[PDB]
Write a protein that binds this ligand. Structure first.
Ligand SMILES: CC(C)[C@H](NC(=O)[C@H](C)C[C@H](O)[C@H](COCc1cc(F)cc(F)c1)NC(=O)c1cc(C(=O)N[C@H](C)c2ccccc2)cc(N(C)S(C)(=O)=O)c1)C(=O)NCc1ccccc1
Length: 373
């Protein structure tokens, strides 16, 4: 039932959203980072200074060794480990047990985060980007094939320490407002989508829309920032720079390298532009927009000052719509229908005079031109 899953995510601010799970017999309780940018289910199986518990394969009567090794690199860190299957369930999720692939993590490099409170990762993207190859069934596929849980999940990530909901197997209407707008998943590997226009405070950025998806645009609950290709990152920074030139910033701030602060309660939100991403819609020549507030891309970092880090950053692997984008929104991963839906969420962040928004329809000729091949 849906209400039982509402508020099943937690997290320390800047440190990820995790859901509670159990692996084994008898069940061992672990916190798992919820990650739509990858496809491997993996937990700490070995003492690590940043970890407070870990999976112990020898305490489980249902563990099965797979006698195959694995390694998974992310933008920001990596780990290797030993594959195997075991029984798994989600306390605050659907009321089932499945046998799934689990990577037992034995060494890692900049992957676990100090004091984050999660010991593992749930990659919810598709088989094709699974390691070591697409034959390792991802958790969610196993979940669907072995139960009657419909092939769909939704994420409401609340920022504003950090909380939210993962509704597994449907949509809870009491968590968003207005209507859901859908964008096709272009290809089932990452959650790849096509961005057809970008505006900053109502001004078209006027780049060739191939640039917005060079070389892909993905939706990713595992990455903090809105990450943009070099060309797009530079046009954006130049605009945001010019809209808030009223104020004083060391330019390593623009690079995410230092903070800016303000006498508490005086942050000048008004000089930071709203950003609109226009996504491919579901019908010919049709798109829609989602608009984020500066409260989403200036993240409060923990004096009686308010300090913020700039959370838009460069990438050479295409656009990443990370938690900065997703925290405004109720995001539906309709795998069954190959689409991703957005609505303003209930826990939306609050400007005095401006609102995070999902709006349509819009006309956009030549949307197919926008995909990079
Ligand atoms: C297996 C495959 C699908 C893999 N997937 C990915 O890399 C996707 C895009 C990234 C994942 O979402 C991956 C999974 O998240 C786990 C993680 C947490 C870490 F602290 C460190 C890590 F290394 C990893 N996330 C990140 O790489 C990542 C995490 C963070 C980050 O801070 N994440 C935390 C947990 C967080 C905080 C708040 C909200 C959500 C998440 C930040 C970044 N940035 C780059 S940034 C500064 O925001 O621009 C990236 C991939 O594509 N690899 C390609 C590759 C190969 C070799 C080398 C580099 C890249």
């Amino acid at each position: 039932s849906f209400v039982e899953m509402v508020d099943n995510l937690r997290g320390k601010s800047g440190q990820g959203y995790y859901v509670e799970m159990t692996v084994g017999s008898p069940p061992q309780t672990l916190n798992i980072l919820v990650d739509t940018g990858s496809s491997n289910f993996a937990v700490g199986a070995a003492p690590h200074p940043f970890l407070h518990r870990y999976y112990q394969r020898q305490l489980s009567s249902t563990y099965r060794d797979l006698r195959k090794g694995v390694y998974v690199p992310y933008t920001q860190g990596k780990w290797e480990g030993e594959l195997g299957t075991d029984l798994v369930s989600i306390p605050h999720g659907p009321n089932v047990t499945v046998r799934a692939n689990i990577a037992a993590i034995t060494e890692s490099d900049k992957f676990f985060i100090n004091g984050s409170n999660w010991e593992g990762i749930l990659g919810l993207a598709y088989a094709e980007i699974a390691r070591p190859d697409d034959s390792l069934e991802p958790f969610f596929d196993s979940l669907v094939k072995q139960t009657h849980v419909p092939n769909l999940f939704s994420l409401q990530l609340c920022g504003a320490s950090v909380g939210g909901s993962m509704i597994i197997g449907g949509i809870d209407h009491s968590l968003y407002t207005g209507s859901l707008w859908y964008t096709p998943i272009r290809r089932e590997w990452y959650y790849e989508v096509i961005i057809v226009r970008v505006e900053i405070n109502g001004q078209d950025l006027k780049m060739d829309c191939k640039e917005y998806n060079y070389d892909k645009s993905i939706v990713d609950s595992g990455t903090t920032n809105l990450r943009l290709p070099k060309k797009v990152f530079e046009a954006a920074v130049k605009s945001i720079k010019a809209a808030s030139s009223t104020e004083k910033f060391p330019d390593g701030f623009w690079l995410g390298e230092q903070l800016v602060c303000w006498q508490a309660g005086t942050t000048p939100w008004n000089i930071f532009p709203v950003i609109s991403l226009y996504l491919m819609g579901e019908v010919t020549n049709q798109s829609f927009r989602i608009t984020i507030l500066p409260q989403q891309y200036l993240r409060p970092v923990e004096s009686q000052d308010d300090c913020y880090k700039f959370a838009i950053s460069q990438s050479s692997t295409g656009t990443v719509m990370g938690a900065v984008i997703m925290e405004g929104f109720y995001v539906v991963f309709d795998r069954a229908r190959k689409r991703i839906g957005f609505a303003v969420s209930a826990c939306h962040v609050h400007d005095e005079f401006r609102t995070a928004a999902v709006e349509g329809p819009f006309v956009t000729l030549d949307m197919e031109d926008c995909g990079y091949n």
